[PDB]
Design a protein around this ligand. Structure first.
Ligand SMILES: [O-]
Ligand SMILES: [Zn+2]
Ligand SMILES: [Zn+2]
Ligand SMILES: [Zn+2]
Length: 274
């Protein structure tokens, strides 16, 4: 991977439009064609799950409005993980709304510094710094009105990467949703000068944890995590919700683990003196 390529994709594909929609029950998609952002409607206001690139905050706000939700009604902002493609609008929306920001405790320094871990001088991976109001750990519960999410610590992609679980209805029945935080290697260094200490063990633990979770609906911070666009095209009133696929996290985590092994081998070979 190259950082140039990460930036090129972030500026073409990840800033492109996608029409917002009700995904399941009180969870709404308001992201772009390449970065997933969600509104969760509660009885006491809105929870915003992530933002997008720093230059895309206006478009996220416009997507929220296309559903009839008010940006002013956002009470809580939750983060999956603290990289600029998910945190770019946090400072802006927090200031405009007075919302509180909730994030995994080990990502707090990243959020509060606005920098990429292990590459802290790289201005093109920086974002507007934002204060964390509540730092969460495994099992912590976050409630707004009628709605509660549970934090799961799923580190690797970032040290504080937090996957968020909540219950929704599909007709009369409960379904369990996971906003999975990301388990890609992406720009991280695994060996040599690792991006952070213990990164390899964190990824390992996260893949295993993901395969053991009982989850009906897999979501994530990029639509490619769960094949959003193909599912969206299959939505029809009266037909089963295509976002319900309870085996998907096991399949996806298996794919992530296999790619992880490839990247670890590649980076290990690249360390050899030549
Ligand atoms: O990311
Ligand atoms: Zn990331
Ligand atoms: Zn990302
Ligand atoms: Zn857990």
């Amino acid at each position: 991977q190259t950082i140039k390529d990460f930036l090129a994709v972030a500026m073409k594909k990840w800033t492109a439009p996608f029409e917002p929609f009700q995904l399941i029950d009180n969870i709404y998609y308001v992201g772009t064609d390449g970065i997933a952002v969600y509104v969760i409607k509660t009885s006491q206001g809105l929870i915003l799950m992530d933002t997008a690139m720093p230059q895309s905050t206006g478009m996220i706000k416009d997507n929220i409005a296309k559903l009839g939700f008010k940006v002013a009604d956002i009470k809580l902002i939750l983060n999956t993980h603290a990289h600029l493609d998910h945190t770019g609008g946090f400072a802006e929306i927090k200031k405009e709304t007075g919302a509180q920001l909730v994030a995994g405790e080990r990502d707090k320094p990243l959020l509060e510094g606005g920098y990429y871990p292990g590459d802290e001088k790289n201005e093109d991976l920086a974002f507007p710094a934002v204060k964390v109001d509540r730092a969460v750990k495994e099992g912590d519960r976050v409630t707004l009105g009628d709605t509660t999410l549970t934090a799961h610590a799923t580190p690797g992609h970032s040290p504080g990467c937090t996957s968020w679980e909540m219950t929704v209805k599909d007709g009369k029945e409960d379904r369990e949703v996971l906003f999975f935080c990301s388990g890609t290697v992406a720009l991280n260094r695994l060996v040599g000068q690792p991006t952070y200490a213990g990164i390899v063990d964190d990824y390992r633990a996260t893949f295993a944890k993901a395969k053991a979770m009982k989850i009906d609906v897999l979501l994530g911070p990029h639509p490619e995590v769960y094949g959003m666009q193909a599912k969206r095209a299959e939505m029809k009133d009266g037909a089963p919700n295509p976002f319900i696929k309870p085996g998907e996290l096991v399949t996806y985590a298996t794919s992530l683990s296999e790619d992880f092994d490839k990247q670890l081998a590649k980076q290990t070979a690249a360390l050899e003196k030549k």
